[PDB]
Amino acid sequence: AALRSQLKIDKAVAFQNSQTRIIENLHDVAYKNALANPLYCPDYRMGKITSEELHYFVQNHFTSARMALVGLGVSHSVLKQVAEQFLNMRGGLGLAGAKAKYRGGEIREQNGDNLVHAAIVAESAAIGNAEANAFSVLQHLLGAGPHIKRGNNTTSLLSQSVAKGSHQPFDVSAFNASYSDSGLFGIYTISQAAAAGEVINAAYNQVKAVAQGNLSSADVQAAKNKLKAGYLMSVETSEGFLSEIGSQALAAGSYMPPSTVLQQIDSVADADVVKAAKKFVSGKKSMAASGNLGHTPFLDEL
Amino acid sequence: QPQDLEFTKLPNGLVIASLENYAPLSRIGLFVKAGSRYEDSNNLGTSHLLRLASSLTTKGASSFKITRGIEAVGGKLSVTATRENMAYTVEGIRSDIEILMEFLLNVTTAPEFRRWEVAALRSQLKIDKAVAFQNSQTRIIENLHDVAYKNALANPLYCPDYRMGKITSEELHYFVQNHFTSARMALVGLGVSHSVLKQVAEQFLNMRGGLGLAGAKAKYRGGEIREQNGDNLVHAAIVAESAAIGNAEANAFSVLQHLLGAGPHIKRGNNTTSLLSQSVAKGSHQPFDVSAFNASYSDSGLFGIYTISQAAAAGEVINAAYNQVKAVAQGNLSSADVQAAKNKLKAGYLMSVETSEGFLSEIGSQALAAGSYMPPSTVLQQIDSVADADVVKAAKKFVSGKKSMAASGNLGHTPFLDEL
Amino acid sequence: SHTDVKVPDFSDYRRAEVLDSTKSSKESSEAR
Amino acid sequence: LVANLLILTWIGGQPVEHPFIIIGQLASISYFSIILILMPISGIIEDKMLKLY
Amino acid sequence: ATFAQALQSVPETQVSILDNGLRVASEQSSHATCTVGVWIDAGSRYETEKNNGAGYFLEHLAFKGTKNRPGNALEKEVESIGAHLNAYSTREHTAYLIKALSKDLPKVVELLADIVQNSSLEDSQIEKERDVILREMQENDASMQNVVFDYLHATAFQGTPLAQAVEGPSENVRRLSRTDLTDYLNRHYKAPRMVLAAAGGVEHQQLLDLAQKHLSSVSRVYEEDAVPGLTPCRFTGSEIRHRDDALPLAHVAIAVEGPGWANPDNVTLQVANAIIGHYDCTYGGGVHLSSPLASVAVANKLCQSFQTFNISYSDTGLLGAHFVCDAMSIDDMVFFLQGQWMRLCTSATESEVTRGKNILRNALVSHLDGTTPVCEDIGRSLLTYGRRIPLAEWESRIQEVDAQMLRDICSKYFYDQCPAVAGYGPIEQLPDYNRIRSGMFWLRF
Amino acid sequence: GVHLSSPLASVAVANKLCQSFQTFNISYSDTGLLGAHFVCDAMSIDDMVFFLQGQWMRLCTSATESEVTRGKNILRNALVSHLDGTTPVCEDIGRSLLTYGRRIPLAEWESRIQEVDAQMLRDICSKYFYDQCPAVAGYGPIEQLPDYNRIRSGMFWLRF
Amino acid sequence: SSKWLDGFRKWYYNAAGFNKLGLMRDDTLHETEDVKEAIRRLPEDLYNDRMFRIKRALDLTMRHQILPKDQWTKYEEDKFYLEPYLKEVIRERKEREEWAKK
Amino acid sequence: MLSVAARSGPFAPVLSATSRGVAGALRPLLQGAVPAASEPPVLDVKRPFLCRESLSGQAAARPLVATVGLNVPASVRF
Amino acid sequence: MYYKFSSFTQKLAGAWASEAYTPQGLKPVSXXXXXXXXXXXXXXXXXXXXXXXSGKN
Amino acid sequence: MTNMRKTHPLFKIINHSFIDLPAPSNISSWWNFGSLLGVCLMVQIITGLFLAMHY
Amino acid sequence: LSRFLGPRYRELARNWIPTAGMWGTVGAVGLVWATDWRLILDWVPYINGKFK
Numbered sequence A: 001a002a003l004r005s006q007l008k009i010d011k012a013v014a015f016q017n018s019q020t021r022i023i024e025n026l027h028d029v030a031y032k033n034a035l036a037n038p039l040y041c042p043d044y045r046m047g048k049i050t051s052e053e054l055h056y057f058v059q060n061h062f063t064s065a066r067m068a069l070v071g072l073g074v075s076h077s078v079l080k081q082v083a084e085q086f087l088n089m090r091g092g093l094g095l096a097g098a099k100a101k102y103r104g105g106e107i108r109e110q111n112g113d114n115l116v117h118a119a120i121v122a123e124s125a126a127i128g129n130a131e132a133n134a135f136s137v138l139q140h141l142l143g144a145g146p147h148i149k150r151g152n153n154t155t156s157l158l159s160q161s162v163a164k165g166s167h168q169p170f171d172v173s174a175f176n177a178s179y180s181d182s183g184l185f186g187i188y189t190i191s192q193a194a195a196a197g198e199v200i201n202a203a204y205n206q207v208k209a210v211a212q213g214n215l216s217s218a219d220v221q222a223a224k225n226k227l228k229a230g231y232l233m234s235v236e237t238s239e240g241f242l243s244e245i246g247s248q249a250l251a252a253g254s255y256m257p258p259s260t261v262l263q264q265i266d267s268v269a270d271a272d273v274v275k276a277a278k279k280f281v282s283g284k285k286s287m288a289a290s291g292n293l294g295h296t297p298f299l300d301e302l
Numbered sequence B: 001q002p003q004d005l006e007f008t009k010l011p012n013g014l015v016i017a018s019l020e021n022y023a024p025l026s027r028i029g030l031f032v033k034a035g036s037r038y039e040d041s042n043n044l045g046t047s048h049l050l051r052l053a054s055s056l057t058t059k060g061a062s063s064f065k066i067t068r069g070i071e072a073v074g075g076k077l078s079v080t081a082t083r084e085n086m087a088y089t090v091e092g093i094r095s096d097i098e099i100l101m102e103f104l105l106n107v108t109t110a111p112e113f114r115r116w117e118v119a120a121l122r123s124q125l126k127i128d129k130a131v132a133f134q135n136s137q138t139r140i141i142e143n144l145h146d147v148a149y150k151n152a153l154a155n156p157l158y159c160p161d162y163r164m165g166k167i168t169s170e171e172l173h174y175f176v177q178n179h180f181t182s183a184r185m186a187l188v189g190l191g192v193s194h195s196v197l198k199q200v201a202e203q204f205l206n207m208r209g210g211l212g213l214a215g216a217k218a219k220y221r222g223g224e225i226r227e228q229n230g231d232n233l234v235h236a237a238i239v240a241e242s243a244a245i246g247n248a249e250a251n252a253f254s255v256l257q258h259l260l261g262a263g264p265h266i267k268r269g270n271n272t273t274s275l276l277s278q279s280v281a282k283g284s285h286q287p288f289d290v291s292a293f294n295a296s297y298s299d300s301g302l303f304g305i306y307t308i309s310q311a312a313a314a315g316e317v318i319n320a321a322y323n324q325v326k327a328v329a330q331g332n333l334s335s336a337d338v339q340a341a342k343n344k345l346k347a348g349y350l351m352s353v354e355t356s357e358g359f360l361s362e363i364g365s366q367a368l369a370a371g372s373y374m375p376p377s378t379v380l381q382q383i384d385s386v387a388d389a390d391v392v393k394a395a396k397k398f399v400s401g402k403k404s405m406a407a408s409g410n411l412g413h414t415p416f417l418d419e420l
Numbered sequence C: 001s002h003t004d005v006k007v008p009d010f011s012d013y014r015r016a017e018v019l020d021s022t023k024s025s026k027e028s029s030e031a032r
Numbered sequence D: 001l002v003a004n005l006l007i008l009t010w011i012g013g014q015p016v017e018h019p020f021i022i023i024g025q026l027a028s029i030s031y032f033s034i035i036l037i038l039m040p041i042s043g044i045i046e047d048k049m050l051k052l053y
Numbered sequence E: 001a002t003f004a005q006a007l008q009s010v011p012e013t014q015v016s017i018l019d020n021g022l023r024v025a026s027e028q029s030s031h032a033t034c035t036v037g038v039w040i041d042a043g044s045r046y047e048t049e050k051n052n053g054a055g056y057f058l059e060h061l062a063f064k065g066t067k068n069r070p071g072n073a074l075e076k077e078v079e080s081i082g083a084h085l086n087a088y089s090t091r092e093h094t095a096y097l098i099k100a101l102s103k104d105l106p107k108v109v110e111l112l113a114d115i116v117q118n119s120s121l122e123d124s125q126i127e128k129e130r131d132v133i134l135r136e137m138q139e140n141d142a143s144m145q146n147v148v149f150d151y152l153h154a155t156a157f158q159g160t161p162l163a164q165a166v167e168g169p170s171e172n173v174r175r176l177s178r179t180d181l182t183d184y185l186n187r188h189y190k191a192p193r194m195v196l197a198a199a200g201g202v203e204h205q206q207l208l209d210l211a212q213k214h215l216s217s218v219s220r221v222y223e224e225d226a227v228p229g230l231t232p233c234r235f236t237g238s239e240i241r242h243r244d245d246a247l248p249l250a251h252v253a254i255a256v257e258g259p260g261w262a263n264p265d266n267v268t269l270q271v272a273n274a275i276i277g278h279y280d281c282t283y284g285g286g287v288h289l290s291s292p293l294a295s296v297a298v299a300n301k302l303c304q305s306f307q308t309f310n311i312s313y314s315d316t317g318l319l320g321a322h323f324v325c326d327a328m329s330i331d332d333m334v335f336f337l338q339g340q341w342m343r344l345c346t347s348a349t350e351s352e353v354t355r356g357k358n359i360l361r362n363a364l365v366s367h368l369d370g371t372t373p374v375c376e377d378i379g380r381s382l383l384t385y386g387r388r389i390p391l392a393e394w395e396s397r398i399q400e401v402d403a404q405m406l407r408d409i410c411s412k413y414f415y416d417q418c419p420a421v422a423g424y425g426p427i428e429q430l431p432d433y434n435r436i437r438s439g440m441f442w443l444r445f
Numbered sequence F: 001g002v003h004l005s006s007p008l009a010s011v012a013v014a015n016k017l018c019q020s021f022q023t024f025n026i027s028y029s030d031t032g033l034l035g036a037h038f039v040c041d042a043m044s045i046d047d048m049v050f051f052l053q054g055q056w057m058r059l060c061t062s063a064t065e066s067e068v069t070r071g072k073n074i075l076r077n078a079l080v081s082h083l084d085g086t087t088p089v090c091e092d093i094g095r096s097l098l099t100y101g102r103r104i105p106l107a108e109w110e111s112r113i114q115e116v117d118a119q120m121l122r123d124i125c126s127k128y129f130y131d132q133c134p135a136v137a138g139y140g141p142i143e144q145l146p147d148y149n150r151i152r153s154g155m156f157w158l159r160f
Numbered sequence G: 001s002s003k004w005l006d007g008f009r010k011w012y013y014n015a016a017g018f019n020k021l022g023l024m025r026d027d028t029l030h031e032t033e034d035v036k037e038a039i040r041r042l043p044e045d046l047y048n049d050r051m052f053r054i055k056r057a058l059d060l061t062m063r064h065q066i067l068p069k070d071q072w073t074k075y076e077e078d079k080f081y082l083e084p085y086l087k088e089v090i091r092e093r094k095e096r097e098e099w100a101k102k
Numbered sequence H: 001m002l003s004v005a006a007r008s009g010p011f012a013p014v015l016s017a018t019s020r021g022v023a024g025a026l027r028p029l030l031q032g033a034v035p036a037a038s039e040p041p042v043l044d045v046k047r048p049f050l051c052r053e054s055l056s057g058q059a060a061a062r063p064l065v066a067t068v069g070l071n072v073p074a075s076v077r078f
Numbered sequence I: 001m002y003y004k005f006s007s008f009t010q011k012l013a014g015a016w017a018s019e020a021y022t023p024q025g026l027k028p029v030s031x032x033x034x035x036x037x038x039x040x041x042x043x044x045x046x047x048x049x050x051x052x053x054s055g056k057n
Numbered sequence J: 001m002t003n004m005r006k007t008h009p010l011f012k013i014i015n016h017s018f019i020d021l022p023a024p025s026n027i028s029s030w031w032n033f034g035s036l037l038g039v040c041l042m043v044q045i046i047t048g049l050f051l052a053m054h055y
Numbered sequence K: 001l002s003r004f005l006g007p008r009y010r011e012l013a014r015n016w017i018p019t020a021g022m023w024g025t026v027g028a029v030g031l032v033w034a035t036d037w038r039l040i041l042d043w044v045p046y047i048n049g050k051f052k
């Protein structure tokens, strides 16, 4: 009862930036259940969550088959001792899930920001697939972010294609998000209110050109190098290493070496990138838009 | 003596309708084509602030003078705005109708729009929006329009929260200048003289005479949105593109709406002749409320089904209503039911126009859309001229057309468009 | 329900002119 | 006015002889005239000179 | 034409009496629609604490089936003719009314007679309507102004049949049976306490012969030679406080005893209520409203809403105000409302007297516009006054009300009188009875 | 929440004064700015200045071995957790060779931490905070920000 | 005759002393309820300029100093910005008093 | 029947927004009252982006990650 | 759908369909009423145990 | 912990009246005469108390 | 100045004349009761007896 006010304050702080709200709305319009559920508490649910509900959630999902205890700088004997001391009392697999069926669609929130955010995604592969590896390679090919402070993003094909026909502030990137049984790959555009249509059209045409096959092996190799470097810098710190081994323990149930990860990333081919881009182009779309939406195109206009 | 309508068209485009029934209360309305559909993405809520700004300072009458004078003479001044139209209606004694005329014309045609007054009025805008969204049906309908249309009719009747606190006197002046022109205005008066109505219109309506800023044609998009807010009752409106108003297909859509159920007729009634109510009550024991929602604006229409049900039974009730409409589209209906629907529509129209407020609204809307009054006997004749095959064709159009869904409540069992 | 709320009896406290509920006031209230 | 109160203090110190009677009457008359008549007219003249109406 | 001769030019209402004593009244208009209803002198003032929900539960069972049309056949006929069927019940009057076209008048009259004198009460329908009336009781006390309405009547007319609510208590809902409903129907649905009122496109001779054909000989007998009588109801100055702080707003109603239906001071009290008035948070007048209470409330942000009411019953009534406000301004609005009341009591002024007269004239004519409200006025007027009071007489009384008789009648009914107070919600700051009384009088007159 | 170890944070949660506060120690060649930056509403600036000055002079007057050990552990964990990562290691190497002329090892840092106790903490705090003229920078609704004389008067106690 | 009147008005404007503090006549206007309503009706930039001028005058009076000769506001650049707002407020107030009087 | 009030039976007051500039002689029913709705919390204003170099990197490219701590501020990673 | 009775004005006023022709709500189950205040017969229920409570240890 | 100067009742009255009283910054030496009048009043209280003590 | 010169204020004033005049009579009788004027109390038929 004292904590629900902090829940409201934390939601406001997390929603202080618009990418959080855009991603929440994008998941809500992309999925029907189990992934349309927001990562933050709804306003009506604030003041309504009870300790009995918390106890039910903990007893149903905090079970031993769904938990993985990892540790850096600790002995395996001590970890096993505390595991058999505490975590042995849990039941089993718990609740199954809801398989996260896809729906597609679009929503557009007009809130009068200076910039317009628009995310257009489609269904992709899940965690543990060569298609998912190809989607990650394609995301780093189209541009997963900047590598230079105040750079021009020469290698980023989406950034080059949008900057070819604009003279205004913008930011276009490839948004990739894989999960247990579903994925979301698409484009994210922050632009002006007037230039949102041409920015989104240029980005979509660039991805369409990639799907048709306008790409070279050198750019695929550069994207693979970017992905390998990003993975290695993720594993580089202790936070990222612990998060990676915990995620691997949950998903695969066994540890996968970074050498093997980079080996399969190298084993990703360019035809798989073309196939993933074709899948994004031909798949049903989910659009989440926010800002001043007078010139932002709709899904059927694309 | 109760006479008929007197209609004139002034050279600046204004339509004047008068009816001298010697009623004890004279009521004068002025109807403009300045609804919320004529705003774009940069000035949303300007129509709402203009609707709430009918008692501000005007050129020739201050806000204090307007309020105190109208309340001292006992008359009333109201603004009824739909997405296409805005009606400024004054009502009072026949003796005070002249100062009621000049107050209404000052408010309509010469608004000063001082900055401090709209700055004070924004809080009243917040209060009015909250009171209007206290019930979920209005919220569902606004969300339904936003989903169904792209640019013109998707603009809400109430100001969006980001635009609140940002509407300015310059934007209000631009809206009034661009849409309060003599070619889009109609002055109707019940209980007054046509000569005095004509003379006050010609000596208050010289300042603006243009055609005005033409709005954009409404574009349909379809889709669905959901307001998961944990209510025990799930509201769900499933509509589709229908005919624009003033068409034989629009008349057929109205007959189909009254066939499927266009509201109750008996207090605490079971709705035994409503086809949707029959199809839902044949399989559901929980309370429900299923009706046919029809809304035909001059550019385009929305026809569909409205449903209030429980959280668990929402899918069953929605599926039963949709299957009933699909059976009507296939052609499982009787001429006795069609005739009963026509009789219900005729009775509803005559009950809408028998009150003097409804009579004023009907004459004003007719004067705006067509420029002449078309008598209720001809309405009865065209309603009779609606055929059964037209109703079947309208139901087929609704079934085949792409859908727009606005839902709210606890939606663990509410289906989607592809689940229908 | 709110209709179940019935005001309890006060006949142990009423004055001599307001004991019965079948006789209207204004002929005794001003005297009181 | 402050000068007039000083004159009134001096006259109240002084006895009842010529010309202290006429100085006291003139001082009291001028004191009341300044405090009741002259100051508001001076304020109105001041507002008119500053062009406030 | 001017207002007075226009009110003369309003058509008059033809009243006739059948042999059984039922009063058939009609007003003809140029509309193509008609509104025909039956108004019956029956209600909570007649119910006697053992059948308190009998009339309202019979209002439930009226449209559920009759002898001639069982089940949904009657509703099917109403839908086929396209009519609208409505009903209501008060503490004194029970009404069943139909809106239809003019050409369906014989069907409407036959259906109304079937509702009135041939209602069938099946036991399964009784149980289903018991569930329905319990659910509607829950919906009624879910709303908040009706709770204060019933609380004010209870604390005002305690110990009398006027305190008990129209829908009755839940225990009476559960224990009412068919025998008590039949006793109530055979006791309080007599011919001489019923008015068949029609308004709109209705021809009086056609209505009279239709009543003679269908609706003649309803009962004509009391089967005991015993007509029940209405005893006077004692009004007790009192207060009821239902404190429940979880509600976000507080509703407070303060009233005094009204004059009655036939009292001539009712017009003057309506003038005073027009002067004080009504307001809610959606009014666009702002701080320039002529009502001092509304202007003060909107200037100081005191209340969400307030209203003045004048309810009248047989030689009694409730005259006062009801306001919705937050917990931090209840004492402020009680003080300002009492100040406005005693301002009318002591220093009523001809300017706002004429303003209130104009407001009352506009309110009367604007309400009486419409076939259903004018039919309701005809039925209620023949039940209460024994005649339909013309708008010319209403305007004559309004014209003869001046400032002196306004302040005299206001001092007679408002000044230095014990009120009935009903508070609901966060009413901690609502002043007690002694402070409300000390506001109800002044020390300077 | 309320039960935070820092008493300034605890009183901030208890009285609902500030939005946030942080403490900074920026160092240049024989120069530094050492103090606190806090953002709050317009009705709590005086309260947070009073509480911050009270905590500063509580450190200057009455240090405690338990809280000193807690702060030493906090600084140890902060140092090692920051130096976790090759990019902060390179940053520390560059900054250390630019400033100290050498890279101070973590063993040397731990030795200095073990050298610090409550007595020299009290001495250093009384040397650097107590009876010292501050630099104050305010931005926003800072009408309730206390006067500079009041800030100085809070920067010396009359009981010490 | 007009030129001598403007010269005498300028001499009085110098002798009043509020030009030496950077103030204008509207700044030196005492805040009656009508004046306060007019100040509330002023736009943002004129309000900020007026309050900064008042604050600077308070600072100069605290230091018992005046502005330098070139920074004195002059007679011809003294603008009567509060005059139309104050006139409108007094007009509305007089209308309210007339309505209450009748 | 060329008006939405006569076209939509029960949905006419939903499709039509009515507000009076001055109070009428007759009071309406269902007056309505705002039940003192709550206020959003005050927050520090975020910087805008007036150039492409400052806007670069703001586009999301990863699943949304929330992070809270006992003594660490919450972080949202895109 | 047009008119519904008003308690305070005692006149048939204007209203929507949802409060004129369905004044009963759409609630699934009729909930029970409140407790019987000022009752002559009172039956208190035993909560837990008296021997289990009253322990200051 | 609390701020005693603004939470203690007599002390918060004293603080709001004389310590944290918002005063104009530019008031001259003519504004000291109220405090001088109060201090002269207290001086008269004490001094006349001793005079009536011996009178 | 001209706030109290109008028809509304005139009729408010002449409505309040009887109440203010009665209050003045109350003040007069209370003052003569408190101060015991010979000039008034020697003319009433009772209270004059105790003066003798």
Ligand code: HEM
Binding pocket: J041, J044, J045, J047, J048, J049, J051, J052, J055
């Ligand atoms: C409680 C407060 C005071 C007390 C107890 C007090 C007491 C006295 C006493 C006992 C005397 C006679 C002793 C003497 O004159 O030798 C006296 C004289 C006097 N008092 Fe006060 N006094 C008080 C306040 C004041 C104030 C406030 C004033 C003026 C503003 C004042 C003005 C005088 C003067 C002028 C004298 C004449 C002294 C002289 O002529 O020698 N007193 N006072």
